[PDB]
Design a protein around this nucleic acid. Structure first.
Lengths: 169, 159, 216, 269, 52
RNA sequence: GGUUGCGGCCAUAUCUACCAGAAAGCACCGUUUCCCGUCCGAUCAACUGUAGUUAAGCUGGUAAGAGCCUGACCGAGUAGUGUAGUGGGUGACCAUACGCGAAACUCAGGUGCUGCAAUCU
RNA sequence: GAGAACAGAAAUCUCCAGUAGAACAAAAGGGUAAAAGCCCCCUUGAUUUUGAUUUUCAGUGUGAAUACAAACCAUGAAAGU
RNA sequence: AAGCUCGUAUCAGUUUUAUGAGGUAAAGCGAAUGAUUAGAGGUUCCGGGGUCGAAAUGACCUUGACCUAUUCUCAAACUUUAAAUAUGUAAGAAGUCCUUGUUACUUAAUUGAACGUGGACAUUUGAAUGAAGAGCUUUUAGUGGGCCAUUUUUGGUAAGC
């Protein structure tokens, strides 16, 4: 077809939403220091509630963004956990998708005996080459509908890559 | 309690024109100002540092001092039974040159020219203005514009 | 504690409607402004009668109601409910005030004279002009004899000289009868539940052809 | 979108839509003390495309900015440089060129000579004694983020070293230690030349030799090795001191054959 | 309580007098940086005309 | 005429949907040794212009398009209004005389102009 | 608005729209979008000397503010403020 | 009241020409913010009900919501637009143009600023009308309860309020 139109992946996010700070969250941070090589960043909270018991400027969740082939590696070894199978609701209109997981040792990590068990969300976004023009400082410019990622582009890329099985239910 | 402030009665005075909010174009900051220049006053609320009082909005004055970012104008103010010189200091954002003089000066240029031209031409010239004199005679051709009779219309069929 | 209406007839004090500045206000006694066969097409009721004012005064919320009912019970009872469509055209937004020289409320004999004689609200009015509709009725050409008398019975319940007009217009349209037919035989007309939607010759041709396909 | 949105939308200015200028900055760079009535206020525009550099000297009118002198990096081949046209060293060279060009356009090339022997030192232009003052320009880095060790303060240095009094401080040059708050002139003299690239070159030439080729394929044209660079850029300097004048291209066509073609592609109404 | 009736008449009886501008007005409010130099300039011109 | 840098007037320049763009140019793009900043060389920094493209961005066309702009034998000399009368009228309000004079509607047409420098078959 | 395990109308995470409908200590009005708002870095121009001016006004005070000068400082790459 | 310096200046409760400011009257809300009557077209896995139901991210009625395209009526403390009247300034000799002197300010500069010398234009000396003179000073009296009429207008039902 053309180069500079295929949906090259850009990043992947590893969110963990605890609900409460403590050593719980440091054990939730020692889990990504090896799965990524990148020291995560702790999400402060934003609003208050009585049900969860949260308040502002409390670090109750962590996330980290990964790019390059490391994201591809993680997703390859994280989809075989899901038996490569995903659903249609998981795919957004904007052309990117995501899914959660519970057993963070399904990836095959050296289990340090103190971190225990806790889940983790993956959200994966991809776009065509040339979406710098939304980000750069000088001469920003939106992208055009002839170049814009869509749900149907996504599932097609996901049928070709990762060999099959989007549960288009 | 009655209020008497520096900006009372300015809900509609200093608020910008419709769809002209934001920064000031640079052609306020390049119009150069000398003393004697005759400037009209018009404030924008976006520039609070240098503002005039609501009185001097609309007025027209003569510059007498020129500093960084700012000028000084002499406006004469009626109060009671006389006028008073008011030497106020403004920023250049609340200002524009008056075009009355830019239209008078060209007229001086022109009448000086035809004065010096009439001395070469051997004729005398008028250069005082004169008002709208009455209309002179004429003959109105009736060839295609032959008059259409008119008459008042009624109320019936109109309502 | 109702004052008469002849005290609040003339448009004297500039309007004082319900707002954040005037929060506590009574509701009106007119709520229903639409009567008869509302959901009836503009085709059924071509004939429009109006009730116009000839002076500049103020109409009470209760008078508007009492004239409304006096016009309804007559038409419903001589012609029927599904014969006409009545629109009370004017809404009372002006608020009426009242001093209410209260002799008490807080201490011994209090609140006398007219220190602080601002008014407590006690009514709503409709400001009305020289040539302005109030009642707009829609029927066939076979029921003007009733509509006229229904309006003539109502003009007694509110003051002033109010003259009745038989409109050149079709229904509650702005167009005259034959112009409306020029448009209806043409495809310049489309129907809505309570009104019409004319066709334009400016706009998107696809969106203008989807609608009015009988045109083109 | 609805109609009441686009009825009320205030469009920003054209160049702010285009993202090409910051008027917050432009105001403060353009305005003058009104007591300096019609004296201009000269800027050093310096911009960084993907494979070219622009340097321009800009005064301001009401009917749009006026260019006194101009210097693009695509004319350094006249002085000897053929590669690395988007280079810290090239920026120094270009700044020096515009500097020397203007300073002889005015008649001040002899009086303010700059620094004809660089060491990487923080040296602002001084005024001559009982004689005309140095040319005072300022600097607008467009939208660029000021960061220590950027190409643009290279041209700041080049103009400063050519002579035309660009007031600045050192703490965005390279070699300036955040900790002790002082400068490293040796590293800066390196960066003036290929000091951050010759090292990469002569590192790959004994670490990874094919990728050295993939990148510096053109340095293997005239067999330009990673010690040739001092003698390249310094000859370029001396050449620029020598003949900085702008000798334009030859126009293959007289601007009308140029329009004659594109007019039959422009797709009129 | 503040009637302004009959003030304009009282003004206009003895008239509303314009301020009677002069040549060479005051220099109390101008930039002193300009004031000094003007003071030095005019003495020089006085001296230069003292000879010619 | 095209493009780029700086710009002036800041929608006739915007917004939405589609199509096209030779030249160079701009851009996207390619790598993290170094200054540098990021959790992430995504942004930002630096390096080569070498690997690859016109898909994007960008420019230009299109649309009984939205929007904006302009102007009228459109509305309307209507509404409003200054002055006057021992004018009308129970009054509210109204007319007349000498004068000024709108807006919304409706219709038609228009869709960026331009300054300095460089540069391109 | 579309999406992601527990996670629900609401924790966290991601994209698109988004002319301000948010925020700017406090009333109300104005003003503001590479900001005047949100986050961060450095800081003490909330300093010294005394004058001119605007508002209220008798063109007296008081209060508050405006624009310069001479010194010293901060900030910033710089203009500049 | 005493006058003083001058003698038709350059002044005026005025018009015109030119150029500015305003946000009231009116107008508008199928334009913003608010207020408001009506139905019709849709949308929901998502507010309630009803039938079919084991259930549904099931179907259909239905009322609520919002979304769309209209529709009726309004705003002293709403407004895109925007009058009338009233209002600021200018209409030359203290001017215009040329020349080139000063300065410690200003400029990259023999640049600019400000003030000047010496020249030419001095007649219609640069709109209308009028001018019973223009300008200036000192001093002191009484007053410092106000009422009425047209029009605009606030409270008040209203008032010879």
């Amino acid at each position: 077809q053309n180069p500079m139109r295929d949906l090259k992946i850009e990043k992947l996010v590893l969110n963990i939403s605890v609900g409460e700070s403590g050593d719980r969250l440091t054990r939730a941070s020692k889990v990504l220091e090896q799965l990524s090589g990148q020291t995560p960043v702790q999400s402060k909270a934003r609003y208050t509630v009585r049900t969860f018991g949260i308040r502002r400027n409390e670090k109750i969740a962590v996330h980290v963004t990964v790019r390059g082939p490391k994201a591809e590696e993680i997703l390859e070894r994280g989809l075989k956990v899901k038996e490569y199978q995903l659903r249609d609701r998981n795919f957004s209109a904007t052309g990117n998708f995501g899914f959660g997981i519970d057993e963070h040792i399904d990836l095959g990590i050296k289990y340090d005996p103190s971190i225990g068990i806790f889940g983790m969300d993956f959200y994966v976004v991809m776009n065509r080459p040339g979406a710098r023009v939304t980000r750069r400082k000088r001469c920003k410019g939106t992208v055009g509908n002839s170049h814009k990622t869509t749900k149907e582009d996504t599932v097609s890329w996901f049928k070709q890559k990762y060999d099959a099985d989007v549960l288009d239910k | 309690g009655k209020s008497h402030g520096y900006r009372s009665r300015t809900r509609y005075m200093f608020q910008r024109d419709f769809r002209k909010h934001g920064a000031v174009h640079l052609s306020t900051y390049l119009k150069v100002y000398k003393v004697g220049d005759i400037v009209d006053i018009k404030a924008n609320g976006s520039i609070q540092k240098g503002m005039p009082h609501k009185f001097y909005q609309g007025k027209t004055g003569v510059v007498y001092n020129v500093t960084k970012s700012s000028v000084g104008v002499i406006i004469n103010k009626m109060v009671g039974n006389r006028y008073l010189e008011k030497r106020l200091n403004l920023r250049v954002e609340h200002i524009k040159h008056s075009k009355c003089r830019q239209e008078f000066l060209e007229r001086v240029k022109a009448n000086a020219a035809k004065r010096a031209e009439a001395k070469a031409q051997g004729v005398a010239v008028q250069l005082k203005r004169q008002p709208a004199q009455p209309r002179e005679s004429r003959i109105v051709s009736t060839e295609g514009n032959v008059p259409q009779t008119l008459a008042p219309v009624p109320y019936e069929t109109f309502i | 504690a109702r004052r008469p209406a002849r005290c609040y007839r003339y448009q004297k004090n500039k309007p004082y409607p319900k707002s954040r500045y005037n929060r506590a206000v009574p509701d009106s006694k007119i709520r229903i402004y639409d009567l008869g066969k509302k959901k009836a097409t503009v085709d059924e009721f071509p004939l429009c009668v109006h009730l116009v004012s000839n002076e500049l005064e103020q109409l009470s919320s209760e008078a508007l109601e009492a004239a409304r009912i006096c016009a309804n019970k007559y038409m419903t009872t001589v012609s029927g409910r599904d014969a006409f469509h009545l629109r009370v055209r004017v809404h009372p937004f002006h608020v009426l005030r009242i001093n209410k020289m209260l002799s008490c409320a807080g201490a011994d004999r209090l609140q006398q004279g007219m220190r602080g004689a601002w008014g407590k609200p006690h009514g709503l009015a409709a400001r009305v002009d020289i040539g302005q509709i109030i009642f707009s009725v829609r029927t066939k050409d076979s029921n003007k004899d009733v509509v006229v008398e229904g309006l003539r019975r109502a003009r007694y319940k509110f003051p002033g000289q109010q003259k009745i007009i038989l409109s050149k217009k079709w229904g509650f349209t702005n167009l005259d009868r034959p112009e409306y037919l020029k448009k209806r035989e043409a495809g310049e007309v489309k129907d809505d539940g309570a009104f019409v939607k004319f066709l334009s010759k400016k706009g998107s041709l696809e969106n203008n052809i989807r609608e009015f396909p009988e045109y083109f | 979108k609805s109609s009441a949105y686009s009825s009320r939308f205030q469009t920003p200015f054209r160049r702010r839509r285009e993202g090409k200028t910051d008027y917050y900055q432009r105001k403060r760079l353009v305005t003058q003390h009104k007591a300096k009535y019609n004296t201009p206020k000269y800027r050093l525009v310096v911009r960084f495309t993907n494979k070219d550099i622009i340097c321009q000297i800009i005064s301001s009118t009401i009917t749009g900015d006026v260019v006194l002198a101009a210097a693009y990096s695509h004319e350094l081949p006249r002085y000897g440089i053929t590669h690395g046209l988007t280079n810290w060293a090239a920026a120094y060279a270009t700044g020096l060129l515009i500097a020397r060009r203007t300073l002889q356009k005015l008649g001040l090339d002899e009086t303010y000579k700059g620094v004809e022997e660089v060491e990487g030192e923080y040296e602002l232009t001084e005024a001559v004694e009982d004689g005309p003052r140095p040319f005072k320009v300022f600097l607008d880095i467009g939208l660029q983020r000021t960061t220590t060790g950027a190409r643009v303060f290279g041209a700041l240095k080049g103009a400063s070293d050519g002579g035309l009094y660009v007031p600045h401080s050192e703490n965005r040059f390279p070699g300036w230690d955040f900790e002790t708050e002082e400068i490293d002139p040796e590293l800066l003299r390196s960066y003036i030349f290929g000091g951050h690239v010759s090292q990469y070159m002569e590192e790959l030439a004994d670490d990874d030799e094919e990728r050295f080729s993939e990148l510096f394929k053109g340095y293997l044209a005239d067999d330009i090795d990673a010690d040739s660079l001092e003698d390249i850029y310094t000859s370029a300097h001396e050449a620029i001191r020598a003949d900085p004048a702008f000798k334009p291209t030859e126009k293959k066509f007289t601007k009308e054959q140029y329009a004659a073609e594109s007019k039959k592609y422009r797709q009129t109404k | 309580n503040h009637t302004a009736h009959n003030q304009t008449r009282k003004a206009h009886r003895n008239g509303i007098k314009k301020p009677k501008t002069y040549k060479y007005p005051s220099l109390k409010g101008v930039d002193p940086k300009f004031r000094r130099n003007h003071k030095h300039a005019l003495h020089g011109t006085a001296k230069a005309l003292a000879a010619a």
